[PDB]
């Protein structure tokens, strides 16, 4: 006979979802500004329409997205292998190979074959092909059902070939699906270790060894992925709010007057711009107003030089004597003004040059000759008991604000500073006024040293540990606490600061007014430095590098306070114990989670329906009744549902039965299916308007065998509601097979196919003594036994034949002794073919590939390579018919036992 598939079909295998991921450059010479590039591409094997999208990028034209271009690829005859995404290992499924015939008026006769694959259990074996001939009417299609059972996990391949009779047309499809184990995805937490190198670990580093994934529910030989999550833990510190700029609108003053009156109007404007620039409240205050006040600051510096005496000193008039306080206060205001506006620096350093030559006794004391006409600007220095020590600290602070600007100009400045600092330490422990200890508390903390006792007296003189207070006008005390805040911010102390700033804010002092020169300048210079240097966070900076033996490199991550990489995940498919080294400052969290396949109940099939499918030979060659009963598992009746019925090979439904079912009230069989021919009708859909949840809705129709076939593939029935194909239920039906399942032998979620031949079919008369020795002496033949059948444990899945090892003719890899028992397994389809009788003796040999269980409970399988021959008893050999066989068996034993197998 002719196998039409001899056409040497190379099946189509390239079915990418996307391709042509290419990069081309239009280098061809342009014609009217348009370059045309011709490009040869090789279309893939898919029979579909491709959408080609092109995007161009040009130096002079930019980005352009072309309109999509479509290419349709088709044939007149082809296979569409409708393969599911995944299939559970050892679960029986029915795939669909749809064959299309788009000939206009030609009815095709096709020979279609499912190719054998050892990874699957089907009707196709190594010695038998699953070929069948089908008929496809023109402009129609036919679905060819194939029943398979995947036997090994991973990407497995299904190939279907087809060739048409009387035309030189052929096609083949070779797609692949994923075989997933019977478990369910599950995630477990491996470790949660908090990283803190300055609290854990030693010498500044923290080593954390992570144990590998501790799974004990994992399906054997399945992949696991371990996800390493390094994540920094951000922390924040409380800070006191800045003063609302709406309360500071009155500090913008046009400076006027003489040498002392000009500085009174210049002070609130310079300190307001300075405080608003640091806090950046100009958006909520008026961005336009910033330039106007900036000109008033220039107006103040311009009119103050009119009263700068030629001796680089400052007085109220050009004929007035110079002041030690007023000169030191112009240095204090001009120094803080340099950051926003500048004109001349020799004016600032010229006043510091005069402030040391004339008003610096080598004792370090600054003494005031007092030509200050305005006692308003003096502040707390006025009406001070220790007016001598409070003034030495005032001028010393003025020199420091100008020290970084006049270091090269005034080279004798560090000498007077050291001398002024020497005078303060001596009489610091003798002061009794809170103002003197506060201004001289910021005067010795600034780039200086306050002794332990001096710091203790500075902190203990704060009444209620938050404020500096003394009998006198409150503007002296507000000025004092402002000096004490600049000291706590110069010493970088932040445990005494919060209650100090809170008191300054609760004072609700917004500057301005009479005699407010010092109080307005200091309260906003201190509160600006608090906003300039403040702990908002705790300085996170972790250098965490993980050394994994899974790779040859160490991945590191600098977890700054920067928000670019707060968390960074590192996946590692290898499940191995790795080391986490973490050093630096701050805190962090490490999370290690491993996903895996946990073995559990395989119960995901038929979770929404009950489905009972029975096939009965109830009484043109053969005629059976296919009965289908289904029931929805919900609290209410299900909506419109589908019965996807598949015929067993060689059978077609009775047309008159379908027309009576289509006339049902809650059923619908489409007119398309009723008008179909009797033959080439192996699939059918019965639509249900509803399926009850309380009772089983049953329908039944007869099926006739219009074509006799040697092997009948089990039919299938599939139920699902229209809105969810995933929630389906499939039952197989087949006469002479248990529940429609193909013959397979399973043990501990490992199955092997049993559709092969029952045993070696060679006849007992066509075999000779030399043929037995040549077969049995092959290395593949592991065991050769003489057995005695003791018991036959009949079961519906497979028959178990308990054999007593009468003689060990050739011992194999299984150490079995004479008298022991071994179980020989064979599917029930071979029960009539083997014809085994109890208490009879048999000669048996087979392959080591037919072993089944573990060594303590080792079972034998009777496969296509297992020799099973009847051994007649000693008295039975007296017959002339058994004389030939007994002479062979008796000689076969003596030749194997006494002399073994050469080579």
């Amino acid at each position, epitope marked *: 006979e002719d196998i039409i598939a001899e056409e040497n079909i190379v099946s189509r295998s390239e079915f990418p979802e996307s391709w042509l991921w290419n990069v081309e450059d239009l280098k061809e010479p342009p014609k009217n500004g348009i370059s045309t590039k011709l490009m040869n591409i090789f279309l893939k094997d898919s029979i579909t329409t491709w959408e080609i999208l092109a995007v161009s990028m040009s130096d002079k034209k930019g980005i352009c997205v072309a309109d999509p271009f479509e290419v349709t690829v088709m044939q007149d005859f082809f296979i569409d292998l409708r393969l599911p995404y995944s299939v559970v290992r050892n679960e029986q499924v029915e795939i669909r190979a749809v064959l299309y015939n788009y000939r206009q008026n030609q009815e095709l006769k096709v020979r279609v074959e499912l190719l054998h694959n050892p990874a699957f259990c089907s009707l196709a074996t190594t010695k038998r092909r699953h070929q069948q001939t089908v008929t496809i009417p023109p402009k129609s299609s036919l679905s060819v059902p194939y029943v398979i059972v995947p036997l090994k996990t991973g990407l497995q391949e299904v190939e279907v070939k087809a060739a048409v009779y009387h*035309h*030189f047309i052929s096609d083949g499809v070779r797609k692949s699906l994923k075989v997933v184990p019977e478990g369910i995805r599950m995630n477990k937490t491996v470790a949660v270790r908090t990283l803190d190198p300055e609290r854990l670990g030693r010498e500044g580093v923290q080593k954390e060894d992570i144990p590998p994934a501790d799974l004990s529910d994992q399906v054997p030989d399945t992949e696991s992925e371990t996800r390493i999550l390094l994540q920094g833990t951000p922390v924040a510190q409380m800070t006191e709010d800045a003063v609302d700029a709406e309360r500071l609108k009155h500090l913008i003053v046009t400076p006027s007057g003489c040498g002392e009156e000009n500085m009174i109007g210049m002070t609130p404007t310079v300190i307001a711009v300075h405080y608003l620039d640091e806090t950046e409240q100009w958006e909520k205050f008026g961005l336009e107003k910033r330039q106007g006040a900036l000109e008033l600051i220039k107006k103040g510096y311009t009119q103050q030089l009119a009263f700068r005496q030629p001796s680089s000193a400052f007085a109220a008039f050009v004929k007035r004597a110079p002041s030690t306080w007023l000169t030191a206060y112009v240095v204090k205001v001009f120094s803080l003004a340099v950051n926003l506006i500048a004109i001349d620096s020799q004016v600032l350093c010229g006043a510091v040059k005069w402030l040391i030559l004339e008003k610096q006794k080598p004792d370090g004391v600054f003494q005031e000759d007092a030509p200050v006409i305005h006692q308003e600007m003096i502040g707390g220095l006025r009406n001070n008991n220790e007016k001598d020590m409070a003034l030495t600290a005032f001028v010393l602070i003025s020199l420091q604000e100008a020290k970084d600007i006049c270091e090269e100009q005034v080279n004798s400045l560090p000498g007077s500073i050291t001398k002024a600092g020497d005078f303060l330490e001596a009489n610091y422990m003798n002061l009794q006024r809170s103002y003197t200890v506060a201004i001289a508390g910021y005067a010795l903390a600034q780039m200086g040293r306050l002794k332990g006792p001096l710091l203790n007296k500075f902190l203990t003189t704060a009444k209620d540990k938050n404020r500096w207070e003394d009998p006198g006008k409150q503007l002296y005390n507000v000025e004092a606490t402002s000096y004490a805040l600049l000291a706590l911010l110069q010493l970088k102390d932040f445990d005494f600061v919060p209650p100090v700033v809170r008191w300054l804010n609760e004072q609700r002092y917004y500057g301005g007014g009479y005699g407010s020169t010092q109080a307005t300048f200091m309260v906003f210079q201190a509160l600006a430095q608090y906003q300039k240097d403040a702990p908002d966070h705790q300085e996170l900076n972790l250098d965490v590098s993980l050394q994994l033996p899974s790779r040859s490199s160490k991945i590191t991550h600098r977890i700054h306070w920067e928000s670019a990489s707060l968390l960074r995940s590192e996946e590692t498919k290898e499940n191995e114990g790795f080391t986490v080294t973490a050093e630096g400052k701050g805190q962090g969290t490490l999370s290690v989670v491993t996903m895996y396949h946990a073995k559990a109940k395989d119960q995901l099939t038929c979770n929404k329906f009950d489905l009972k499918v029975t096939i009965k030979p109830a009484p043109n060659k053969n005629t059976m009744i296919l009965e289908i009963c289904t029931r929805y598992r919900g609290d209410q009746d299900a909506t419109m549902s589908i019965l996807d019925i598949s015929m067993m090979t060689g059978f077609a439904p009775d047309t008159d039965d379908l027309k009576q079912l289509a006339n049902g009230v809650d059923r619908y069989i489409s007119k398309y299916e009723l008008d179909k021919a009797f033959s080439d009708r192996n699939t059918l859909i019965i639509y249900l308007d509803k399926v009850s949840h309380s009772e089983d809705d049953c329908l039944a129709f007869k099926v006739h065998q219009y074509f006799n076939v040697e092997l009948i593939q089990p039919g299938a029935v599939k139920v699902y509601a229209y809105y969810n194909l995933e929630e389906s239920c499939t039952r197989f039906y087949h006469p002479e097979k248990e529940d429609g399942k193909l013959n397979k032998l399973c043990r501990d979620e490992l199955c092997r196919c049993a559709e092969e031949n029952c045993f070696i079919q060679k006849s007992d008369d066509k075999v000779t003594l030399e043929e037995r020795l040549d077969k049995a002496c092959e290395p593949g033949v592991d065991y050769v036994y003489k057995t005695r059948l003791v018991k036959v444990q009949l079961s519906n899945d497979f028959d178990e034949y308990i054999m007593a090892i009468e003689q060990t003719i050739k011992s194999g890899s299984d150490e079995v002794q004479v008298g022991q028992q071994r179980t020989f397994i064979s599917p029930i389809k071979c029960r009539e073919a083997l014809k085994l009788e109890e208490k009879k003796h048999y000669l048996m040999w087979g392959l080591s590939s037919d072993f089944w269980g573990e060594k303590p409970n080792l079972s034998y399988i009777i496969g296509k390579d297992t020799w099973v021959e009847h051994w007649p008893e000693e008295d039975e050999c007296q017959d002339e018919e058994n004389q030939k066989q007994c002479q062979d068996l008796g000689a076969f034993t003596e030749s194997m036992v006494v002399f073994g197998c050469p080579n």
Partner: nanobody, 123 residues
Framework: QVQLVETGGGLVQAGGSLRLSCAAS????????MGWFRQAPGKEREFVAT????????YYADSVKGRFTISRDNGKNMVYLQMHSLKPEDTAIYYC????????????????WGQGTQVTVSS
């Protein structure tokens, strides 16, 4: 497209033999049907032989059923027609044609034909 050139013809005696070689323009691979056709003087163009794409299937006309043998070489872009045991009724112009594979025994599925060659078998 593709065109064909027929060679190997000529004059022969009644009993002898000769093979005709068909040369293809482009790659003959992926072309399912390659057929030979002949037209005798005073008669219509009739079917002779077709060959499969891989060469594993052929079809012959009943008149030349067991006397001709069609073969192809997909690597050389060549088709051949070995003619044995000639008869005086085989005198015709022999045409080489490219087909689609559908109905390979009819000329209605051949869109690319050749010049043809004269094979005169004299009595």
């Amino acid at each position: 497209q593709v065109q064909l050139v027929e060679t190997g013809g000529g004059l022969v005696q009644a009993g002898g033999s000769l093979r005709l070689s068909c040369a293809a323009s482009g790659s003959i691979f992926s072309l399912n049907a390659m057929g030979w056709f002949r037209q005798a003087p005073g008669k219509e163009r009739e079917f002779v032989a077709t060959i499969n794409r891989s060469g594993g299937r052929t079809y012959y006309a009943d008149s030349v059923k067991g006397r001709f043998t069609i073969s192809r070489d997909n690597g050389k872009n060549m088709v051949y027609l070995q003619m044995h045991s000639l008869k005086p009724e085989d005198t015709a112009i022999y045409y080489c044609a490219a087909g689609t594979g559908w109905s390979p025994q009819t000329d209605n599925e051949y869109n690319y034909w050749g010049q043809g060659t004269q094979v005169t078998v004299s009595s």
